[PDB]
Design a protein around this ligand. Structure first.
Ligand code: HEM
Ligand SMILES: O[C@](Cc1ccccc1Cl)(Cn1cncn1)C1(Cl)CC1
Length: 529
């Protein structure tokens, strides 16, 4: 009968629970291994799902290959499966949609369909603090971006340019990496100098002289502490009780405390001007429902703004230096533009004159094409998503992944994509531009279409608002580098490959260049010890 088989189910169960633990832990790995494999083969039979990349190790998925070489990973998947495909990543299912259609499917997705803050809050909230960026409803984000943008105006950039210039010259004068008054040539690691120059120039201009002054003290170590807490590791283990995580948390409290100290001091003195982003957020951080940002939230939002601009910009100036190091022809061409626009150095650099340096701006544009700082952008899917002109459905709980930086490197959209060529942007020197209709999500009119193959600043509701600041900063910095120095590689060295494991696609260090003064006898004035 069949009842006697049912007895043997029970018997077999009892014999299973009595196996030697050698065989039993052997089975606790062999069962999920086999089940994973069986599940994938079953999955490939669904026609309402994008092809899923095969993987051996459950939960881990394609994490290794994706983690180390994501563009190579995407190209292989693209050849095998086309532009839409899925892969497992440390517990999650990522659906990749490559190319301009993918830009459109993700950046222009319905607010109800996808969530950025659901993807990122665990990465950023620990670092920035509560109440801001991804620790708040999207509508709050939209207004925060409006608040920050309102400090990032043309009139602010006119005032930031000499402050940024002052910092670059102070760095050339005082830093051990240069000391131009004492040395006429030297070797630097751009992954040491550019992060420093970046935080010095961004602090001075966006936070002001007090906050810049504090980076000359041991307080600077908190920034370094806070900086470590910004790592992909936060995606799997956002909070685990080790030391790294406590120095981070301490840094957040300590730095936000310093900003709040200055904010409350400015208000108690009625010392509220138009100097910096701090003045600006103090005068302009009331939401449309009338709720005012707290001083804590203002401080946290300052941290997020500085942190965002820090890693994107520092990686970008590093790459610019690295590409130009093997292109003395491009340095020469940029130097001639500087001499023409600044009347042989006699004109002081201003924001308006920066806008008349198309080749310098094209050099930034081309670096951002070859080295998009963020190789992958994510959203969590909130509701089932039908993929147009397919029968594909992306179910809620999945994640979508868009990669404009991958398209940046495709010969079909950029001929000879792997060649650094600033002249591919001749008569097209703008950081970005909308080829047509606009829309406003709450922080200004931006392009409605997100189909450009070039999208260094993303698009849609989550689009960057830092692009003009980053061009101002990079522009001032590279204008001074060009006028002051020539540089090249040590023998046999060339452009390093990207390190894709970090949060930005920074160069693999150490990435060293050799500088020499164009004018060995030129002195940088000012007092120093
Ligand atoms: C070369 C420099 C930069 C590049 C290439 C860059 C790139 C991007 C990209 C691709 C996004 C969209 C992210 C997504 O869709 O998930 C973004 C968003 C954003 N960025 Fe930047 N960024 C840069 C610098 C900056 C700077 C300097 C600031 C501030 C001064 C900044 C602040 C922001 C903010 C507030 C968002 C909005 C995020 C959201 O709404 O979800 N970024 N950036
Ligand atoms: O978009 C960011 C997050 C981010 C967004 C706004 C402000 C700061 C940060 Cl760090 C990075 N970023 C974007 N612009 C500046 N930083 C990443 Cl790390 C990709 C998810």
């Amino acid at each position: 009968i069949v009842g006697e088989a049912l007895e043997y189910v029970n018997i077999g169960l009892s014999h299973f629970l009595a196996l030697p633990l050698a065989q039993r832990i052997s089975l606790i790995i062999i069962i999920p291994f086999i089940y994973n494999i069986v599940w994938q083969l079953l999955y490939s039979l669904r026609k309402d799902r994008p092809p899923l990349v095969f993987y051996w190790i459950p939960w881990v998925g394609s994490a290794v290959v994706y983690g180390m070489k994501p563009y190579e990973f995407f190209e292989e998947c693209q050849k095998k499966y086309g532009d839409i495909f899925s892969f497992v990543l440390l517990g999650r299912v990522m659906t990749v949609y490559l190319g301009p259609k993918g830009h459109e499917f993700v950046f222009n997705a319905k607010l109800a369909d996808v969530s950025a803050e659901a993807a990122y809050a665990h990465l950023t909230t620990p670092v920035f603090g509560k109440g801001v960026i991804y620790d708040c409803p999207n509508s709050r984000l939209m207004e925060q971006k409006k608040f920050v943008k309102g400090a990032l105006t043309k009139e602010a950039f006119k005032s930031y340019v000499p402050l940024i210039a002052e910092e670059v010259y102070k760095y050339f004068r005082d830093s051990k990496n240069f000391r131009l008054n004492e040395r006429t040539t030297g070797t630097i690691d751009v992954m040491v100098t550019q992060p420093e120059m970046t935080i010095f120039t961004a602090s001075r201009s966006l936070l002001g002289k007090e906050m810049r002054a504090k980076l000359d003290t041991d307080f600077a170590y908190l920034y370094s502490d806070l900086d470590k807490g910004f790592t992909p590791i936060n995606f799997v283990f956002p909070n685990l009780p080790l030391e790294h995580y406590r120095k981070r948390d301490h840094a957040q409290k300590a730095i936000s405390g310093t900003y709040m100290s200055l904010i409350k001091e400015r208000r108690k003195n009625n010392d509220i001007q138009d100097r910096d982003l701090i003045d600006s957020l103090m005068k302009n951080s009331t939401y449309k429902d009338g709720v005012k940002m707290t001083d804590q939230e203002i401080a946290n939002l300052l941290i997020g703004v500085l942190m965002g601009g820090q890693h994107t910009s520092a990686a970008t100036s590093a790459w610019i230096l690295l590409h130009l190091a093997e292109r003395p022809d491009v340095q020469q061409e940029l130097y001639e533009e500087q001499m023409r626009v600044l009347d042989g150095g006699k004109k002081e650099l201003t924001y308006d004159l920066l806008q008349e340096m198309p080749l310098l701006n094209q050099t930034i544009k081309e670096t951002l094409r070859m080295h998009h700082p963020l190789h992958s952008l994510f959203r969590k899917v909130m509701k089932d998503m039908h993929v147009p002109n397919t029968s594909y459905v992306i179910p809620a709980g999945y994640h979508v992944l868009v990669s404009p930086g991958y398209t940046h490197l495709r010969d079909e959209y950029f001929p000879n994509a792997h060649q650094f060529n600033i002249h591919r942007w001749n008569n097209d020197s703008a950081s970005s531009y909308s080829v047509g209709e606009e829309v406003d999500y709450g922080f200004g009119a931006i392009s409605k279409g997100v189909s450009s193959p070039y999208l260094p600043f993303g698009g849609g509701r989550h689009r960057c608002i830092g692009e003009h600041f980053a061009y101002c900063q990079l522009g001032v910095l590279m204008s001074i580098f060009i006028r002051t120095l020539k540089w090249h590689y040590p023998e046999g060295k060339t452009v390093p490959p990207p390190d894709f494991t970090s949060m930005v696609t920074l160069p693999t260090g150490p990435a060293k260049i050799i500088w020499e003064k164009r004018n060995p006898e030129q002195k940088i004035g000012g007092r120093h010890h």
